[PDB]
């Protein structure tokens, strides 16, 4: 069994910038989700080998996790807030695609997603 390489977190070929919105995504959004009691499954890529999930990376072809997002934000990898919001949405959606309704991990994702929605609702206007 083998895991894929993780999503990239650095690429000199990719345009990037700092924006006040991206700063909020790190300081408010990421930080709020990261400290949550239910964050831990999402703090790093799914280890399909150790979890014995050999079909995971057949079903989930665009993996994403908050460890990757955190590094992307700390590295200023993004051009805009939408790119980062899309990564969060991919992460939640992947969990719902792979798992069953009412599974613990789905309840965890829902708790994080509720906070994510609350925080992104107050994403500042771009400066
Ligand atoms: C470190 C990680 S990452 C992760 C998980 C763990 C431990 C777990 C998980 C399970 C319960 C709780 Cl309380 C918390 C987490 N769920 C897997 C799916 C899975 O294991 N399905 C199975 N089907 N029967 C046998 S195991 C999963 N799906 N997305 C993510 C992200 N995970």
mmCIF file of C-alpha atoms and ligand atoms in Angstrom:
data_model
loop_
_atom_site.group_PDB
_atom_site.id
_atom_site.type_symbol
_atom_site.label_atom_id
_atom_site.label_comp_id
_atom_site.label_asym_id
_atom_site.label_seq_id
_atom_site.Cartn_x
_atom_site.Cartn_y
_atom_site.Cartn_z
ATOM 1 C CA UNK A 1 0.000 0.000 0.000
ATOM 2 C CA UNK A 2 1.326 3.506 -0.775
ATOM 3 C CA UNK A 3 0.206 7.058 -0.190
ATOM 4 C CA UNK A 4 0.497 9.648 -2.967
ATOM 5 C CA UNK A 5 2.823 12.595 -2.593
ATOM 6 C CA UNK A 6 1.091 15.340 -0.669
ATOM 7 C CA UNK A 7 -0.295 18.431 -2.388
ATOM 8 C CA UNK A 8 2.417 20.961 -3.105
ATOM 9 C CA UNK A 9 2.986 23.808 -0.701
ATOM 10 C CA UNK A 10 5.728 25.624 -2.607
ATOM 11 C CA UNK A 11 6.070 26.260 -6.339
ATOM 12 C CA UNK A 12 8.127 29.137 -7.730
ATOM 13 C CA UNK A 13 6.113 28.895 -10.949
ATOM 14 C CA UNK A 14 2.897 29.825 -9.291
ATOM 15 C CA UNK A 15 1.960 33.486 -8.885
ATOM 16 C CA UNK A 16 1.295 34.566 -5.364
ATOM 17 C CA UNK A 17 0.793 37.588 -3.203
ATOM 18 C CA UNK A 18 -0.228 38.708 0.237
ATOM 19 C CA UNK A 19 -3.675 40.219 0.626
ATOM 20 C CA UNK A 20 -5.465 41.332 3.799
ATOM 21 C CA UNK A 21 -8.028 38.656 3.043
ATOM 22 C CA UNK A 22 -5.362 35.947 2.980
ATOM 23 C CA UNK A 23 -4.017 37.292 6.248
ATOM 24 C CA UNK A 24 -7.513 36.866 7.767
ATOM 25 C CA UNK A 25 -7.681 33.359 6.364
ATOM 26 C CA UNK A 26 -4.552 32.501 8.361
ATOM 27 C CA UNK A 27 -5.000 34.484 11.540
ATOM 28 C CA UNK A 28 -8.768 33.969 11.942
ATOM 29 C CA UNK A 29 -10.027 31.118 9.855
ATOM 30 C CA UNK A 30 -7.178 28.584 9.915
ATOM 31 C CA UNK A 31 -6.277 29.302 13.497
ATOM 32 C CA UNK A 32 -9.894 28.872 14.681
ATOM 33 C CA UNK A 33 -10.323 25.555 12.936
ATOM 34 C CA UNK A 34 -6.849 24.273 13.830
ATOM 35 C CA UNK A 35 -7.396 24.531 17.624
ATOM 36 C CA UNK A 36 -10.857 22.911 17.546
ATOM 37 C CA UNK A 37 -11.204 19.611 19.381
ATOM 38 C CA UNK A 38 -12.190 17.925 16.125
ATOM 39 C CA UNK A 39 -9.352 19.312 13.998
ATOM 40 C CA UNK A 40 -6.864 16.476 14.424
ATOM 41 C CA UNK A 41 -7.982 14.192 11.537
ATOM 42 C CA UNK A 42 -7.639 17.167 9.203
ATOM 43 C CA UNK A 43 -4.240 18.475 10.341
ATOM 44 C CA UNK A 44 -2.288 16.359 7.840
ATOM 45 C CA UNK A 45 -2.929 14.305 4.693
ATOM 46 C CA UNK A 46 -4.936 11.116 5.088
ATOM 47 C CA UNK A 47 -2.520 8.268 5.652
ATOM 48 C CA UNK A 48 -4.377 5.602 3.732
ATOM 49 C CA UNK A 49 -1.684 3.047 4.482
ATOM 50 C CA UNK A 50 -1.772 3.269 8.259
ATOM 51 C CA UNK A 51 -5.563 3.757 8.315
ATOM 52 C CA UNK A 52 -6.014 0.752 5.981
ATOM 53 C CA UNK A 53 -8.096 2.703 3.471
ATOM 54 C CA UNK A 54 -6.755 1.337 0.158
ATOM 55 C CA UNK A 55 -9.632 2.820 -1.810
ATOM 56 C CA UNK A 56 -9.247 6.333 -0.381
ATOM 57 C CA UNK A 57 -7.075 7.735 -3.159
ATOM 58 C CA UNK A 58 -9.205 6.025 -5.783
ATOM 59 C CA UNK A 59 -12.322 7.896 -4.599
ATOM 60 C CA UNK A 60 -10.572 11.113 -3.526
ATOM 61 C CA UNK A 61 -8.602 12.421 -6.497
ATOM 62 C CA UNK A 62 -8.083 15.966 -5.174
ATOM 63 C CA UNK A 63 -6.888 15.467 -1.591
ATOM 64 C CA UNK A 64 -6.640 18.418 0.742
ATOM 65 C CA UNK A 65 -6.039 18.917 4.424
ATOM 66 C CA UNK A 66 -5.429 21.766 6.844
ATOM 67 C CA UNK A 67 -1.742 20.953 7.254
ATOM 68 C CA UNK A 68 -1.337 21.708 3.565
ATOM 69 C CA UNK A 69 -3.500 24.810 3.817
ATOM 70 C CA UNK A 70 -1.539 26.047 6.806
ATOM 71 C CA UNK A 71 1.755 25.662 4.974
ATOM 72 C CA UNK A 72 0.311 27.297 1.845
ATOM 73 C CA UNK A 73 -0.806 30.288 3.934
ATOM 74 C CA UNK A 74 2.480 30.509 5.848
ATOM 75 C CA UNK A 75 4.380 30.287 2.558
ATOM 76 C CA UNK A 76 2.144 32.863 0.865
ATOM 77 C CA UNK A 77 1.351 30.288 -1.854
ATOM 78 C CA UNK A 78 -2.003 31.773 -2.870
ATOM 79 C CA UNK A 79 -2.868 34.614 -5.227
ATOM 80 C CA UNK A 80 -6.291 35.276 -3.729
ATOM 81 C CA UNK A 81 -8.714 34.283 -0.984
ATOM 82 C CA UNK A 82 -10.851 32.248 -3.338
ATOM 83 C CA UNK A 83 -8.023 29.792 -3.952
ATOM 84 C CA UNK A 84 -7.680 29.165 -0.231
ATOM 85 C CA UNK A 85 -11.454 28.976 0.372
ATOM 86 C CA UNK A 86 -11.585 26.398 -2.381
ATOM 87 C CA UNK A 87 -8.985 24.290 -0.580
ATOM 88 C CA UNK A 88 -11.110 24.295 2.608
ATOM 89 C CA UNK A 89 -14.172 23.358 0.614
ATOM 90 C CA UNK A 90 -12.312 20.542 -1.084
ATOM 91 C CA UNK A 91 -11.228 19.193 2.236
ATOM 92 C CA UNK A 92 -14.787 19.134 3.633
ATOM 93 C CA UNK A 93 -16.277 17.768 0.443
ATOM 94 C CA UNK A 94 -13.723 14.957 0.290
ATOM 95 C CA UNK A 95 -14.730 13.871 3.796
ATOM 96 C CA UNK A 96 -18.400 13.790 2.843
ATOM 97 C CA UNK A 97 -17.703 11.967 -0.445
ATOM 98 C CA UNK A 98 -15.659 9.199 1.169
ATOM 99 C CA UNK A 99 -17.583 8.634 4.383
ATOM 100 C CA UNK A 100 -21.217 7.919 5.412
ATOM 101 C CA UNK A 101 -23.743 10.386 6.901
ATOM 102 C CA UNK A 102 -23.580 10.386 10.672
ATOM 103 C CA UNK A 103 -20.105 8.874 10.769
ATOM 104 C CA UNK A 104 -17.991 10.499 13.502
ATOM 105 C CA UNK A 105 -15.614 11.948 10.998
ATOM 106 C CA UNK A 106 -18.535 13.581 9.124
ATOM 107 C CA UNK A 107 -19.821 15.097 12.367
ATOM 108 C CA UNK A 108 -16.289 16.436 12.951
ATOM 109 C CA UNK A 109 -16.117 17.930 9.503
ATOM 110 C CA UNK A 110 -19.523 19.519 9.979
ATOM 111 C CA UNK A 111 -18.416 21.163 13.235
ATOM 112 C CA UNK A 112 -15.362 22.621 11.555
ATOM 113 C CA UNK A 113 -17.310 23.682 8.507
ATOM 114 C CA UNK A 114 -19.819 25.554 10.636
ATOM 115 C CA UNK A 115 -17.004 27.609 12.139
ATOM 116 C CA UNK A 116 -15.430 28.063 8.729
ATOM 117 C CA UNK A 117 -18.690 29.489 7.388
ATOM 118 C CA UNK A 118 -19.077 31.781 10.378
ATOM 119 C CA UNK A 119 -15.592 33.168 9.908
ATOM 120 C CA UNK A 120 -15.669 33.548 6.129
ATOM 121 C CA UNK A 121 -18.917 35.419 6.433
ATOM 122 C CA UNK A 122 -16.794 38.295 7.795
ATOM 123 C CA UNK A 123 -13.936 38.115 5.329
ATOM 124 C CA UNK A 124 -12.792 41.751 5.085
ATOM 125 C CA UNK A 125 -13.087 43.827 1.971
ATOM 126 C CA UNK A 126 -9.848 43.744 0.014
ATOM 127 C CA UNK A 127 -7.564 46.697 0.787
HETATM 128 C C1 LIG B 1 -6.173 10.483 11.106
HETATM 129 C C2 LIG B 1 -7.550 10.217 10.491
HETATM 130 S S1 LIG B 1 -7.879 11.032 8.982
HETATM 131 C C3 LIG B 1 -9.543 10.270 9.002
HETATM 132 C C4 LIG B 1 -9.616 9.490 10.085
HETATM 133 C C5 LIG B 1 -8.514 9.458 10.882
HETATM 134 C C6 LIG B 1 -8.409 8.599 12.157
HETATM 135 C C7 LIG B 1 -10.883 8.729 10.353
HETATM 136 C C8 LIG B 1 -11.603 9.057 11.664
HETATM 137 C C9 LIG B 1 -12.612 8.096 12.183
HETATM 138 C C10 LIG B 1 -13.217 8.360 13.350
HETATM 139 C C11 LIG B 1 -12.845 9.593 14.107
HETATM 140 CL CL1 LIG B 1 -13.569 9.909 15.653
HETATM 141 C C12 LIG B 1 -11.979 10.454 13.612
HETATM 142 C C13 LIG B 1 -11.312 10.160 12.342
HETATM 143 N N1 LIG B 1 -11.864 8.496 9.334
HETATM 144 C C14 LIG B 1 -11.315 8.249 7.988
HETATM 145 C C15 LIG B 1 -12.237 7.323 7.218
HETATM 146 C C16 LIG B 1 -12.125 5.924 7.813
HETATM 147 O O1 LIG B 1 -11.243 5.571 8.540
HETATM 148 N N2 LIG B 1 -13.165 5.020 7.366
HETATM 149 C C17 LIG B 1 -13.242 3.651 7.820
HETATM 150 N N3 LIG B 1 -14.207 2.751 7.426
HETATM 151 N N4 LIG B 1 -14.087 1.638 8.319
HETATM 152 C C18 LIG B 1 -12.865 1.526 8.805
HETATM 153 S S2 LIG B 1 -12.051 3.023 8.965
HETATM 154 C C19 LIG B 1 -11.203 9.596 7.330
HETATM 155 N N5 LIG B 1 -11.871 10.103 6.330
HETATM 156 N N6 LIG B 1 -11.431 11.412 6.192
HETATM 157 C C20 LIG B 1 -10.566 11.671 7.116
HETATM 158 C C21 LIG B 1 -9.879 13.013 7.297
HETATM 159 N N7 LIG B 1 -10.362 10.538 7.869
#
